[PDB]
Amino acid sequence: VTLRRAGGTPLVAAMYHLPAAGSPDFVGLDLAATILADTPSGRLYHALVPTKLASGVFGFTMDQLDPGLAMFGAQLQPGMDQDKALQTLTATLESLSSKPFSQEELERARSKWLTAWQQTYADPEKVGVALSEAIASGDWRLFFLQRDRVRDAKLDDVQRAAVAYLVRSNRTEGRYIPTEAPL
Amino acid sequence: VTLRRAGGTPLVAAMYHLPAAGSPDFVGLDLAATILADTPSGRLYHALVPTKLASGVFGFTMDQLDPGLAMFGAQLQPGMDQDKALQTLTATLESLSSKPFSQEELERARSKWLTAWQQTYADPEKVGVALSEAIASGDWRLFFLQRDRVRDAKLDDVQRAAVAYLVRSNRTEGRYIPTEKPQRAPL
Known part of the structure; x- marks a missing residue:
């Protein structure tokens, strides 16, 4: 991979279905997403960026879809390992029970x-x-x-x-890998 | 303020439920309450007394009750408004994440x-x-x-x-308001 034509950005995403906005659970998820997706002091950022698995991360909930969705994602530089970023992204998201939210994070x-x-x-x-x-x-x-x-x-x-x-079991995965004389 | 019959002034309070006395958390709350209600050094005082927001401040834990409660209170001056005092008292109690206790305060x-x-x-x-x-x-x-x-x-x-x-989430709010004596002519 000595030569690369300048090109698109690979993407990685994880999506989860939310409960109805009026249900009791929704607000908590919206806050959890908030804690998770903070840049630069968030959990996703630390897991993926300094670590060098992604250039940047995002996350938010989307209430105006029917039904609702929470989305977390990464943008990567070309040649970064797409599988690893996805596995890391999902692991950080789905492991809270091992690394529970602090009050400090919540406030x-x-x-x-x-x-x-x-x-x-x-x-x-x-x-x-x-x-x-x-x-x-x-x-x-x-x-x-x-x-x-x-x-x-x-x-x-x-x-x-x-x-x-x-x-x-609630996870949908999104991936984008951009297609690719005298050189 | 312009006129009042002589009598008591209102006191405002905030109560929070406590973990069991047997829990280790309990002691932390007991010490935190003691830090918080220190007068005049303490945080509650500073927030309320010299802001002329309150006449006096108190705080303590009560383990004899089943279950336990922590209570913090403000005795108002006449014409100080309750809602403000209560708001500032609760807001100051509930904002420790923004301001951490100090070793000095703990010791x-x-x-x-x-x-x-x-x-x-x-x-x-x-x-x-x-x-x-x-x-x-x-x-x-x-x-x-x-x-x-x-x-x-x-x-x-x-x-x-x-x-x-x-x-x-854990807050209960108390207001002791003395009943106003009836107004009298010619005042």
């Missing part, structure tokens, strides 16, 4: 979520859109209820939810 | 505890009473065991325990 997560919420609520374009989604989704309250749930979420509940949801 | 709190233990131990009426309670609780050793745990506690343990239990 930082909760604080960031609430900050974003307050930002939406304070923004006239945004709140209106958020309420429409809650209404279209069948419960107008749910924009408000999630905030309440985020404040009251116990670490044990977040941990239990992550462990139950971020599991192989 | 001072540990010494107060040990002194209190010693006073009880020395005094024959009291020690018997303490041993009785330990026995009722189902472990005779507890009086002695708690002291050793206090001696053995590490700052991270205390810091970790405080942060785990001092949480809104």
Whole structure:
């Protein structure tokens, strides 16, 4: 691999199906995702980047899909080992029971979520859109209820939810490997 | 403030449930409460008294109750508003992750505890009473065991325990509001 034509970026991803937004588990997962995907101080980043398995990581939950999905992913430089990054990515995600969330991690997560919420609520374009989604989704309250749930979420509940949801049986894998004179 | 009949002022409180006295976490919370409610040095005071937010501050743990509770309170001045005081009190209790305890704080709190233990131990009426309670609780050793745990506690343990239990999920809120005497002419 002395010569490489300049090209695309290989991708690796793991996706997990979420419970309904109105269900009790959802907020915990959304926080767990938050803890997991933080750059640069997150668990995924440490597992993959300094380690040199990926250039960068991402993660988020996607409530507006039907049904809902949580996605975690990596972008890699060409020639980095795609299988290893995927296995590492999934292992970090599905091993929380061995390495449980700290309160410190959770409070930082909760604080960031609430900050974003307050930002939406304070923004006239945004709140209106958020309420429409809650209404279209069948419960107008749910924009408000999630905030309440985020404040009251116990670490044990977040941990239990992550462990139950971020599991192989709930896992869908995404991969992209970019195709490839006188040289 | 402009006019009030003479009487008591409101007090605001926050209570958090505690682990079992037999748990090692318990001691960490006991010491954390002692750090937190230190007046006037202590954090609660600083947050509330000179902000003229509160007249006075208290905090302690109660292991005789089944189960245990930690209580923190603020005695308000007239016209101080309850909601603010309660909010700042709870917010300061529930934010230790943002501000860690210090070795200095732990050793001072540990010494107060040990002194209190010693006073009880020395005094024959009291020690018997303490041993009785330990026995009722189902472990005779507890009086002695708690002291050793206090001696053995590490700052991270205390810091970790405080942060785990001092949480809104665990919060109960109390307001003692004195009933206002009826207004009288000509005032």
